[PDB]
Amino acid sequence: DASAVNADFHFSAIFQPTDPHHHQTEFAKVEGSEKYVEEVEVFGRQALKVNPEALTILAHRAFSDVHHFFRKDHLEGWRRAIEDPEASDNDRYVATTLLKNACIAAGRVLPSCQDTGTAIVLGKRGELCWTGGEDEKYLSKGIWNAYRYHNLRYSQTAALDMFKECNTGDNLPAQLDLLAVPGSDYEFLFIAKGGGSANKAYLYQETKALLNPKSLRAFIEEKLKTLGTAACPPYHIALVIGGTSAEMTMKTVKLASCRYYDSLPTTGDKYGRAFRDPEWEKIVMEVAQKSGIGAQFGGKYFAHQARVIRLPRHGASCPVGLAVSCSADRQILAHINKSGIYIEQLEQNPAQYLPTSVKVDLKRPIDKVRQQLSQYPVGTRVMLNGTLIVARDIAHAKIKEMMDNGEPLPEYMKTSPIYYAGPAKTPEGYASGSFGPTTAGRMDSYVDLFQSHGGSYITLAKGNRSKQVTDACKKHGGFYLGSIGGPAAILAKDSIKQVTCLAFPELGMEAVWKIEVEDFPAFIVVDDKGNDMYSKTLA
Amino acid sequence: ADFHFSAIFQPTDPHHHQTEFAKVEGSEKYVEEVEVFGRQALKVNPEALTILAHRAFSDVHHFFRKDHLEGWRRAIEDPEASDNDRYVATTLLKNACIAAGRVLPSCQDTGTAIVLGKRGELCWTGGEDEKYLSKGIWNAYRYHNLRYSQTAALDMFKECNTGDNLPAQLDLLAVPGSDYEFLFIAKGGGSANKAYLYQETKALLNPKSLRAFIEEKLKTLGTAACPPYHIALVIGGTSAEMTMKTVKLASCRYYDSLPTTGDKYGRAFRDPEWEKIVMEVAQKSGIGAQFGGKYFAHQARVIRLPRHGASCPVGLAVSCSADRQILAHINKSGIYIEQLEQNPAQYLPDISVKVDLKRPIDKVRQQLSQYPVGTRVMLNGTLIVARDIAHAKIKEMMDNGEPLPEYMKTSPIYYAGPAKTPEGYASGSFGPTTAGRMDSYVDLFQSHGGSYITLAKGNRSKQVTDACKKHGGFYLGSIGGPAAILAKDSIKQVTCLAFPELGMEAVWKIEVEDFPAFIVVDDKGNDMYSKTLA
Numbered sequence A: 001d002a003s004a005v006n007a008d009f010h011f012s013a014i015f016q017p018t019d020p021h022h023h024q025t026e027f028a029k030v031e032g033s034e035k036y037v038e039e040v041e042v043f044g045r046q047a048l049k050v051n052p053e054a055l056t057i058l059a060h061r062a063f064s065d066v067h068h069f070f071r072k073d074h075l076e077g078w079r080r081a082i083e084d085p086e087a088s089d090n091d092r093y094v095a096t097t098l099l100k101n102a103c104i105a106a107g108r109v110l111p112s113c114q115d116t117g118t119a120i121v122l123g124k125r126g127e128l129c130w131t132g133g134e135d136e137k138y139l140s141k142g143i144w145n146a147y148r149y150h151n152l153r154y155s156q157t158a159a160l161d162m163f164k165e166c167n168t169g170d171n172l173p174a175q176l177d178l179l180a181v182p183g184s185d186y187e188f189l190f191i192a193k194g195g196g197s198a199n200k201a202y203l204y205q206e207t208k209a210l211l212n213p214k215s216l217r218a219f220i221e222e223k224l225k226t227l228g229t230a231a232c233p234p235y236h237i238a239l240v241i242g243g244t245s246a247e248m249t250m251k252t253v254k255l256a257s258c259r260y261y262d263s264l265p266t267t268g269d270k271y272g273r274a275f276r277d278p279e280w281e282k283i284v285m286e287v288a289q290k291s292g293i294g295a296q297f298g299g300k301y302f303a304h305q306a307r308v309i310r311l312p313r314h315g316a317s318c319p320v321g322l323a324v325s326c327s328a329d330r331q332i333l334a335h336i337n338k339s340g341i342y343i344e345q346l347e348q349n350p351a352q353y354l355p356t357s358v359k360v361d362l363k364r365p366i367d368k369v370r371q372q373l374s375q376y377p378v379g380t381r382v383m384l385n386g387t388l389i390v391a392r393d394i395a396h397a398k399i400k401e402m403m404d405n406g407e408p409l410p411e412y413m414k415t416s417p418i419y420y421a422g423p424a425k426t427p428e429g430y431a432s433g434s435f436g437p438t439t440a441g442r443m444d445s446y447v448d449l450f451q452s453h454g455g456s457y458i459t460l461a462k463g464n465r466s467k468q469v470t471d472a473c474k475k476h477g478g479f480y481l482g483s484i485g486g487p488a489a490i491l492a493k494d495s496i497k498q499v500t501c502l503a504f505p506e507l508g509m510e511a512v513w514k515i516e517v518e519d520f521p522a523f524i525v526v527d528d529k530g531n532d533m534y535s536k537t538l539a
Numbered sequence B: 001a002d003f004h005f006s007a008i009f010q011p012t013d014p015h016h017h018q019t020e021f022a023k024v025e026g027s028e029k030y031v032e033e034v035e036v037f038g039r040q041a042l043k044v045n046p047e048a049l050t051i052l053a054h055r056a057f058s059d060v061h062h063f064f065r066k067d068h069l070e071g072w073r074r075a076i077e078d079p080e081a082s083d084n085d086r087y088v089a090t091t092l093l094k095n096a097c098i099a100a101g102r103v104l105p106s107c108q109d110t111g112t113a114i115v116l117g118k119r120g121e122l123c124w125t126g127g128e129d130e131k132y133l134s135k136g137i138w139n140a141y142r143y144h145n146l147r148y149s150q151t152a153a154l155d156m157f158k159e160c161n162t163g164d165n166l167p168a169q170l171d172l173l174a175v176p177g178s179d180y181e182f183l184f185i186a187k188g189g190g191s192a193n194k195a196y197l198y199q200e201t202k203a204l205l206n207p208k209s210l211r212a213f214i215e216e217k218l219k220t221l222g223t224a225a226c227p228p229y230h231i232a233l234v235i236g237g238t239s240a241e242m243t244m245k246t247v248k249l250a251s252c253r254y255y256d257s258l259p260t261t262g263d264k265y266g267r268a269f270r271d272p273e274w275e276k277i278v279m280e281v282a283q284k285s286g287i288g289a290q291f292g293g294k295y296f297a298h299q300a301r302v303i304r305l306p307r308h309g310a311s312c313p314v315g316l317a318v319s320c321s322a323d324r325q326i327l328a329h330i331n332k333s334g335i336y337i338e339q340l341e342q343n344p345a346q347y348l349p350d351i352s353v354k355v356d357l358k359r360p361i362d363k364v365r366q367q368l369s370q371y372p373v374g375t376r377v378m379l380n381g382t383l384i385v386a387r388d389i390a391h392a393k394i395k396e397m398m399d400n401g402e403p404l405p406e407y408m409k410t411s412p413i414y415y416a417g418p419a420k421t422p423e424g425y426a427s428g429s430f431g432p433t434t435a436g437r438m439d440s441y442v443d444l445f446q447s448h449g450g451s452y453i454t455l456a457k458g459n460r461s462k463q464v465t466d467a468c469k470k471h472g473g474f475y476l477g478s479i480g481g482p483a484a485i486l487a488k489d490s491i492k493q494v495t496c497l498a499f500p501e502l503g504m505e506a507v508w509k510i511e512v513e514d515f516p517a518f519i520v521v522d523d524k525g526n527d528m529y530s531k532t533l534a
């Protein structure tokens, strides 16, 4: 029957930010850009004409500025990570390491991170914003300019078929999300999203049984360990409870990690509105600090901050989104209006935020090095000096085809440790472009096979690894060293001296490189006995 | 300046000329075409958005696509389909025939209202698109015999039903031109829940792991979202939401006309070869269209995407048997809406045990214990009805030391939630609700003396199977999806007893006749799904 029914109709938008036009953000205008606009009035309504050339130009300051600078809230976290008495020493060192990288990047020659990311555009074209309609082509051109004329990295791999792939050669196409919105302006958020943090976007399908403090707290405790250290913490953690579909939930959790939703309300209503959840944002941070995971190597600063947005849901549904912003916190707001192009101003003076080292010579027989490494327990910090072999997914895959017919393991797979990494482009007159590690766990499947054929005894990367790497190292007497994640520019400037392609030339950044390093920082993570320095915080 | 743009998605029919559209009578009166600065523009009375959205989210609950219908006839015409496959597919065709009377919707789950809108550069709406589309949905759902399925969160844990099926998911994209194109999807919660994302690696990208992965992953869909499934698989993507958005649209066939070859500039393509490999496992899995057989799935879509070198996202999502999406567009001639097939009967190829439920459960348990799992049966008599809120509430009642609800001890428990009742009808659409979402309560409740006889849809955990074997219980599987034909033909009387504030989740009392179900788990350790997970 009808007795709990209702009455009149009231539209309430799901997203109701209190700062819809991002007035809380400081913007700078692109000089002379009033030449791109003309005030008109049509059918009694005011409209705005935009030269589509502006999109290439606009997308190119944003996708240039953003690879060298961070937002103040990211930077405040780094100053804070150093000054907190409760931060571990390793937090401070990593934050110091991360802070030193950011200072190098502001020189505009070396990019702040090695993984210069996927180019993502969120666009909102006003009803009366007239661009000529070629928005997508010109925006893609601006990213291309940033990536063609600067020392960034091409990270996107096109699939010619299921297994045959080729590089696009310019890190294009971009993700262009152009939304239709009210008004006559054009608003943008540009995001250069690292693959590592894009990969740390997880979807779980849960139920109402989850929606209680005890279960949800336990869920967050349980699931946070699965984020690990593989996306260069401190993290901005975003958690989205509810959503009208998985993809909408994941888009929402993506933007929260990007602080796009910071000005939402903090209470729900009977009409179903998004809200920020301060209590559960606080709860996420409490879990992060007590987790002991720390800034890559143990401590309190697993996370800068957290955003938790509660959304409405279908009775049959409970989508949940979890996503991070990484150390390379890279986003930029902008808008176009009758006065021209305005672009979020980032902090040009990072300096106000500015406040165990055992040398291991790798230029020795690897058997002497294995013996020395075998002398120390996991968690031991080290500084590496000598030759590294650089190889990641495609180089591993190329190496795997030889290995797949059961013999021989190529000799070049047996002489040196395998460094999972991919460098950014080398600036003119510089020895190396940005060059930090990439997540070890993704190459985990190659170690046991290679070790069983007498190679890949030592691997070097970032991120927690699977039991197979621990098991492999214990059986064969191997070691895994973790470089600091994020400081790609200062490693290249001070530590990385030469890069040459060794194998698989047809590949791009994913070829095998041979490099010689000095003062390369790492921790002994896995020893030759079954030990793993993450076994307590990451099980 | 050696730059060449290649869109990721390059459909060969981006405006869906292959789809048939009808003009809304008189809708040319709501628009007037103008030309500004040498370009063509369109003034649109936003009532067109309401009208389209209010007809779209009415029509789509009563009719299906031909490619959907063709699948059921194929399931009927295949000599290798099981008998149980053919009955369900026939029932769905019969349900569609029941639904075509335009009063009862084919499913009780009127879905999440999803609108994909694509506003051309020179398409001018007045800017209140969101308000006017939402107004149209409210009209469709307020004035029709649908269901209000959206639950507003007052805080993180306190929830209430919104009472009108709003808000919708409105993904309005900016594209070239001056027209307005739409795909409307009424997405059931059960299948929305059965959209899974896995983070895999290059190590997957070999025949054995991917084939095995597909074998492994297909089973995790189970039968809990009312198969036959349209299965869409997307390998790669630039972000989770893009992988999941793409697999959603592929499963709704929005991307069916993509190219079949890739290129060096990074474009999506369909891979027909791997669709065939997915289907053989689906058929040989034995999971079937809910109750065993070959027609676990109607068809598959597999799209290979570009990827970040460090990444290999994989998205899996389905459109269920209640396949409810409608393409539409607004142009210079008025409002055009995809014309669906209004005579589904043409897809029908024209060329048991009487159980008295009005007894003590001990007589039924003794009799039922005599039969093996997998038997099709037709039930006649009393069912006790309880779902999500009652399930959450029943655990809460027992936690305050009050054991087992009065209504849980007198009758077999039928897990279900009704749609609104049409004037003069005994019942609105009244199909089952997924048992699996309540599994964590199931072991507790049976161990505490309740839920001895269950009737629902979906695979259940081994603990539920073990319980019926341990306690001499039975789980009966209703067919999932045919909510309308059960109400018209099987359910004769329904009365509300307590807790009306729960809406669709209130307690109801119903009398049924010729109610079909399967013996899924018996009281002897047998489970008709035991072969689904090998």
Ligand code: SF4
Residues within 6 Å of the ligand: A113, A114, A115, A116, A117, A193, A194, A195, A196, A197, A230, A231, A232, A326, A327, A328, A436, A437, A438, A485, A486
């Ligand atoms: S900081 Fe770490 S997670 Fe972020 S883009 Fe760089 S390597 Fe990837």
Ligand code: SF4
Residues within 6 Å of the ligand: B107, B108, B109, B111, B187, B188, B189, B190, B191, B224, B225, B226, B320, B321, B322, B431, B480, B481
């Ligand atoms: S077929 Fe099943 S899962 Fe799909 S909408 Fe209908 S009731 Fe929901």
